[PDB]
Design a protein around this nucleic acid. Sequence first.
RNA 1: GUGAGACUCCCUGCCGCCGAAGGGGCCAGGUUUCCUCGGCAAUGUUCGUCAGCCGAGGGUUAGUCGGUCCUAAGACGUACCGUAAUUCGAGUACGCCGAAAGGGAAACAGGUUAAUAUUCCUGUACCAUUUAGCGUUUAGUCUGACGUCUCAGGGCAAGCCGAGCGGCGUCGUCGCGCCGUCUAAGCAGCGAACCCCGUGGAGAGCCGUAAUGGCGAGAAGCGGGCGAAUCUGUAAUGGCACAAGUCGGCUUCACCCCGGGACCCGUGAAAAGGACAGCUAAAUGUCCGUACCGAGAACUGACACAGGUGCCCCUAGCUGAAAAGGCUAAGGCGUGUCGGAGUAAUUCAGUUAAGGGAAUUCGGCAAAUUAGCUCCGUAACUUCGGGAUAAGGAGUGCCUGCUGUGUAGACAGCAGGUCGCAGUGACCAGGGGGCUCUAACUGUCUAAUACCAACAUAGGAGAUUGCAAACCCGUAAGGGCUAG
RNA 2: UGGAGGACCGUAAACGGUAUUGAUCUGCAAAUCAUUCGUGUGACCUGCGUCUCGUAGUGAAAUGCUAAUCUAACCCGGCA
Lengths: 94, 82, 238, 100, 56, 51
Amino acid sequence: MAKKFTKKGRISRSAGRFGPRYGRKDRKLVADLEERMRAPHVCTKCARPTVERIGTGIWKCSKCGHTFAGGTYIPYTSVGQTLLRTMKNIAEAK
Amino acid sequence: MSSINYPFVTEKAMMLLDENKLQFIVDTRSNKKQILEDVEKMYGFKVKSVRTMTTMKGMKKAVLAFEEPEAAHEIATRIGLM
Amino acid sequence: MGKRLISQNRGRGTPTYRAPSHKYKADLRHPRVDENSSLRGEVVGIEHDPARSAPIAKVAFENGEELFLLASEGIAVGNIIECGDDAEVKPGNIVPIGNVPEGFFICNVESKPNDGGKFVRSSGVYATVVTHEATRTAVSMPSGNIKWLNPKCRAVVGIVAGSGRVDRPWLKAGKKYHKMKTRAAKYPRVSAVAMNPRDHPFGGGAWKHPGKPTTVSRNAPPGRKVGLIAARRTGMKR
Amino acid sequence: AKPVKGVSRGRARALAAKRKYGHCKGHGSRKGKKGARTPKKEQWIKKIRALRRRLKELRADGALDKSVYCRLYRKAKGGEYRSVSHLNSHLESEKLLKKE
Amino acid sequence: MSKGTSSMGKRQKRTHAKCRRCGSVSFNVHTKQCTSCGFGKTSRMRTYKWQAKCKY
Amino acid sequence: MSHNMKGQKKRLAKAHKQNTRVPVWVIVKTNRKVVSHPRRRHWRRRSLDVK
RNA sequence: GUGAGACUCCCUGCCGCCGAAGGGGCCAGGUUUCCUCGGCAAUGUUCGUCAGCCGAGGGUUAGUCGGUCCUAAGACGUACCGUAAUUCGAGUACGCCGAAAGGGAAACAGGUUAAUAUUCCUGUACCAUUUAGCGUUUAGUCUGACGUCUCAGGGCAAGCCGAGCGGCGUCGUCGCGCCGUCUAAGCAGCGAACCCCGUGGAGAGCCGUAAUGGCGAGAAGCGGGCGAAUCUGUAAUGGCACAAGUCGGCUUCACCCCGGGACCCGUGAAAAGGACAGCUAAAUGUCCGUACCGAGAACUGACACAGGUGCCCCUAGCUGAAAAGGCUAAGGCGUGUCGGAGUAAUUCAGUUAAGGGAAUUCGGCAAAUUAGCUCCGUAACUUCGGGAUAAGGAGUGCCUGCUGUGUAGACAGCAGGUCGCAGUGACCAGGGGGCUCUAACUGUCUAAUACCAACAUAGGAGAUUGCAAACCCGUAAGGGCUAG
RNA sequence: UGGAGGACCGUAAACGGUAUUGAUCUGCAAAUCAUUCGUGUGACCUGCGUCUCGUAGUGAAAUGCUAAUCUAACCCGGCA
Ligand SMILES: [Mg+2]
Ligand SMILES: [Mg+2]
Ligand SMILES: [Mg+2]
Ligand SMILES: [Mg+2]
Ligand SMILES: [Mg+2]
Ligand SMILES: [Mg+2]
Ligand SMILES: [Mg+2]
Ligand SMILES: [Mg+2]
Ligand SMILES: [Mg+2]
Ligand SMILES: [Mg+2]
Ligand SMILES: [Mg+2]
Ligand SMILES: [Zn+2]
Ligand SMILES: [Zn+2]
């Protein structure tokens, strides 16, 4: 279903395009960022894992076309989640 | 300030007398409309178009294609080119 | 006259240090609203702003004035934007901070009333409304300063979109080169110790060193105020 | 105007006929990398198009219903078959056609 | 590549055109000013006291 | 094929017709005391100060 | 032959150079160098009857090609304001310019001259504006109008193959080799993908693509609409020795249409113009450029300069991965403008050199070795990406006959025979490895003695500043950073 | 299968200019030629346009470059 994750080759991940350059720390950071960004994201409207990046901070649900502005690499940031749940508590409590 | 100087006669300029055309040396400041109007005033013959060009000697050569037949030969005879 | 610093060249305003102003989408500011007035509008599209490397929302209001807006996080297409004091405290809304409950996050804050938004505009930054008083209101800015602002200073609720942009390491001089193409900044920058003594205060010598203390006074003239300008302290946290 | 003395091509045509038969093409004449003489993506393209066309014709004439045609299509996607002949031999081995 | 005859074959363009007001090839094509008479900068003709010597 | 306007071609025309020798009768009339002028030139030399 | 005068000019033949540039087209630039005639005092690295020279005369024709029009980076003007003052200065408001390679209303084939040609002539067209007749707005949108990489489908120039037909070459024997067998815009018609609409009802899942994918928030299937390049028909008489002039097939780039995907802390221009209400008639379509070179002789470097501008855009057959290199077309040339002579030393650049093989030298400097492709195999160390073409090896031609994949071009493979010292037979084309120092790496650098360990870099850290800020420019008006 | 990379090999495409301390050094050339070399999908090369300049500009920083001129250009003037 996926690539031949070879007996040695699941360390570089997507950052094997950089070859041996740029050191292990920066390659690890960029590989983790690509893994976090490329994962499926459930849309808030249609609730289907279809949200995908279109630009720097722009995300779009492929099914319902719900285009929204989020993080540069992650759609929903934890601070925005904190703000939304704070307003949710304020609306529920009163 | 006449636009017409004189008819232009070379071997190539006399090659168009059979074609009803007649090539003139005109004032370089003039345009096609002024050459057409001044030729029609000077000889009365009607002109169909004007093919103008400026040469490297500092002059302008105009070729007037007439409408009535034999107007080029008539003008050449009246001027004495032929 | 030893040669003027890079800061003096930048202040003179030469093409090397000028921003490519034609590359940017639009100046970001809050819509102009008369006092005791309001306007609604809907998002017609999320675009990309080269000036900030973050999304900006194209908002069509009720008077038909298509105005680019700074995009808070979570704003989408077809959302309704509201302005004025009567506007509900909701993410993406433009309201005075005097109506915002304490503890909320705001961004694109105005220094003065009807300012257009000065503070809290980078990708992901936010401010916290701390306290409410009759003539004042405290907002905890992204730096950390408890700035005191007027109660009528508008601000859009929510954190600025594009959070996490600096999380990715640059990883390559070409990537930062391509970012700095659309910027006003000079890239790359030569270290001052590598310069000759005519060019910088710190240049010259048989070996790379300043030769003088890098902490410069606040009362230094232009062309001398380099290094650590007016430092309270130096070094890592011992 | 004197005649054009164009480059003759009879020896070239003789060599082309021999090459068409399969000769004059050994490893001493191959000078370019295997991948320039024949690209790999074109080989995949022709192979998968032949396999999908054979499966489409089998599903069209009723010899291959949708339940096994879908599996065979995904198998041809996954590279289980080497050619149309290999697909036919596997079909006649595991009997995926609706023989009646 | 050199600074001498190698890079002097790139002189296929102009920086001064023939000025209207004086007929001299001194009209800069970028500043729009003739550097001999000053047409395009002033109504008067540029003339300076250092163009000749002190008369004493 | 440099693309001249009208005045540039007029200036090149005057430069072209300046580049001709003195007539023979001028030399004969002047007792051969006028045999040249400064405007003689060749195209494969110092370029024109025309355009 | 010409000429008084011939290595040097002209014709013929032979032998040659370039042939992905030394050929073809044109920007900037040159400015008549273009073409015909007549000369050789100077120019030409010799002479010269020759000539980009000297002298005389001639040559450039536009509604359709460009400029013109539009706006971009960005200039300039007027006013305000500043300045001792201005021809000086930032900003603002109103204008105006800014691209012969961005946007863009429209023309093609053949002929003609010594030199002009999508311009002149023949044929067949098309575009715009205004005037008149006949009626209407849909008027707010679309187009103009967009980056990089990668790829599918369709078409086509160029190329190639088979049959017939017409000429030329070869013809010691053979029956082959070469050339040609042509047909534009405009007008009329069909329309592949994508998109939209009407039905449809798919899950112990089905439909697809090269690949990603799509689907009850409605897939497959069936219809319909919108819709390309090209193709077909006409233009059908033009040119071809009025000689054939008719056919089939393959391939098709780097050209055109169309669609998909991926990437971005890069988001990849604007405006004029154009479409949606036009149809018919007539007249008008001014001005500028148009020759010629575009470079080992027409530019620039003092020059007929081995540089640079231009390798900026195109370039046929064979070999071959190839536009590499070699050999040939077409085309351009024998002008990278001195000849005879074959007799030393020495010298610039090459070929070969017994036995030894770095003993030379500051130092393997130079030269030599190896070299393509397929297959086997590949170590230390490592940031797990690499090192790696590591290293170390085998095969390779030609002929006879076949097989497999593909729709096809073509690709891959096998059996037997056979020649040579040698089968990537020429051309083409890494020598390899180990241990240290230094810098992480790609990059940048003393144009004209230093391509380095220096500079930059990502990474790390520190400092100032809450924006009427920090920092900086200006005498000021006012500005850069900052559409932050 | 896929087609990422300041990835690799590589041209007499383009750009650069290592070594021969070869040729040349009153040269083809006021720095060029031959062979040998580095980059050659990007911090790339380059046409045209436009802008930044003298105690000033530009500089991946050598006091390099700013018209064969640079630890302060060039022209005229102070200057006999
Ligand atoms: Mg004209
Ligand atoms: Mg100092
Ligand atoms: Mg005086
Ligand atoms: Mg050859
Ligand atoms: Mg001589
Ligand atoms: Mg204009
Ligand atoms: Mg280094
Ligand atoms: Mg360093
Ligand atoms: Mg390379
Ligand atoms: Mg210099
Ligand atoms: Mg002096
Ligand atoms: Zn959704
Ligand atoms: Zn002037």
